[PDB]
Design a protein around this ligand. Structure first.
Ligand SMILES: [Cl-]
Ligand SMILES: [Cl-]
Ligand SMILES: [Cl-]
Ligand SMILES: [Cl-]
Ligand SMILES: [Cl-]
Length: 278
């Protein structure tokens, strides 16, 4: 696989490989995402979930959230990819986490990047200042946080104020993705991915891990694509038969636009190449 990478670099065809993926990617309707009543539930009018794979909210209200269930059958893992919650969709976001029984939330952006807001402050920064989402009847409390040099893991308690039931949610926040471009090295990103794995958050006993960046297709796509390919390499008899392009096209049946740049495609290959050694 490093041989294919080398040939693509020693030729400069990443732009070519990437545009072919764009051309071959699935197109399915997003009728619900584009309904007028959902205008303010979408961070980017150009990034919408497909109707067939969108996550539906269960409460008696508009069921819409910009989130997609990516179900990877051969790798036997599901992910929920979603946009960075908006100030008016944080309650919906946590309702989704509750209803989908997710145990982990993976965040790949800072709330502020290059001086701009990519995401709402959707979890509490202080133990004593919990967040109440009156619309969806949820309370979210910061229990503790383990701040590391390249990522933070937070223990959150999500309480359904309706049943008084509580659940521990792990919040995995990769905090050092560069402002521009992709990490020169996949080392940190891979260490982060393995930390999420060993937390048990992506275990099949839980709901799908929720993964988001700002639009939920770029860095998020890199995360899911790398994780899925590494799973496929541990399963197949011929690990080098894993075709990253084919995997990405499979994931793009479930959410449009996964991997936003040729650089992100190149980084994904690099992350799988390096992650396979370990
Ligand atoms: Cl909200
Ligand atoms: Cl942040
Ligand atoms: Cl930077
Ligand atoms: Cl494959
Ligand atoms: Cl695209």
């Amino acid at each position: 696989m490093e041989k294919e990478f080398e040939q693509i670099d020693k030729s400069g065809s990443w732009a070519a490989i990437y545009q072919d993926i764009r051309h071959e990617a699935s197109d399915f309707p997003c009728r619900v995402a584009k309904l007028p009543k959902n205008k303010n539930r979408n961070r980017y009018r150009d990034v919408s979930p497909f109707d067939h794979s969108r996550i539906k909210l269960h409460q008696e209200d508009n069921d819409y959230i910009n989130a997609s269930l990516i179900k990877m059958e051969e790798a036997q893992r599901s992910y929920i990819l979603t946009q960075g919650p908006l100030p008016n969709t944080c309650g919906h976001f946590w309702e989704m986490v509750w209803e989908q029984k997710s145990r982990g939330v993976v965040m790949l952006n800072r709330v502020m990047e290059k001086g701009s807001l990519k995401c709402a402050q959707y979890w509490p920064q202080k133990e004593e200042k919990e967040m109440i989402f009156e619309d969806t009847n949820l309370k979210l409390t910061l229990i503790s946080e383990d701040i590391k040099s390249y990522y933070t893991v937070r223990q959150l308690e999500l309480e359904n104020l309706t049943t008084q039931e509580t659940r521990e949610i792990l919040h995995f926040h990769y905090t050092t993705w560069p402002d521009f471009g992709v990490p020169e090295s996949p080392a940190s990103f891979l260490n982060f991915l393995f930390k999420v794995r060993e937390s048990g958050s992506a275990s099949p006993e839980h709901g799908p891990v929720v993964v988001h960046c700002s639009a939920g297709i770029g860095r998020s796509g890199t995360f899911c694509l790398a994780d899925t390919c590494l799973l496929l390499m541990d399963k197949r008899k011929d690990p080098s038969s894993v075709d990253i392009k084919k995997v990405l096209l499979e994931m793009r049946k479930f959410r449009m636009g996964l991997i936003q740049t040729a650089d992100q495609l190149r980084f994904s290959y690099l992350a799988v190449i390096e992650g396979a050694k370990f």
